[PDB]
Amino acid sequence: GGLVPRGSHMASKRDKIADIQEALAHADANADQHLDFDEWRQELKCRGHADADIEAVFAKYDVDGDRVLDAEEQMKMAHDLEGQKSDLNNQLAELE
């Protein structure tokens, strides 16, 4: 029963972005173009994610702890997520 006993470490990363990128992008429910904790937390949560788990992933984006990130910081997010994705998709699965 070789194959793989446990891992999916890298794969998971792809699933997160793939699931987070679309969900949000294809979400702009309140067409606000901003990222309020409520929307993020709630949106991601239903994706099989817990309430606390998202805290660590999100907090990493708090610059001044002002708890407010508009299109200003949003660019950095998409930008950073885009590069990491490209490097990952390389071996995992094509895309570009």
Side-chain angles (χ1 to χ4, degrees):
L3 282 295
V4 60
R6 53 179 61 176
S8 182
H9 186 70
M10 298 181 91
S12 298
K13 297 181 180 179
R14 194 88 188 286
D15 185 77
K16 290 179 180 179
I17 303 170
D19 185 83
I20 294 168
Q21 188 177 39
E22 298 181 331
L24 192 93
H26 304 3
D28 303 308
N30 191 243
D32 56 307
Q33 208 74 252
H34 306 335
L35 267 59
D36 301 312
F37 187 78
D38 185 69
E39 302 292 308
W40 184 276
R41 182 252 177 180
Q42 190 178 63
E43 181 181 296
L44 228 173
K45 184 178 181 179
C46 302
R47 315 296 194 181
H49 281 254
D51 56 306
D53 294 35
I54 300 166
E55 212 299 318
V57 183
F58 172 84
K60 83 193 299 85
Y61 279 108
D62 297 343
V63 185
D64 302 317
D66 294 341
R67 202 184 179 190
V68 66
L69 306 94
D70 304 292
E72 190 179 341
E73 296 172 300
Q74 199 185 121
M75 293 178 185
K76 298 171 62 275
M77 188 182 267
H79 187 263
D80 298 320
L81 267 66
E82 187 65 29
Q84 295 177 79
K85 187 179 180 181
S86 180
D87 187 76
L88 258 69
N89 104 90
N90 184 38
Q91 303 295 102
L92 280 157
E94 57 181 82
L95 215 305
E96 55 181 81

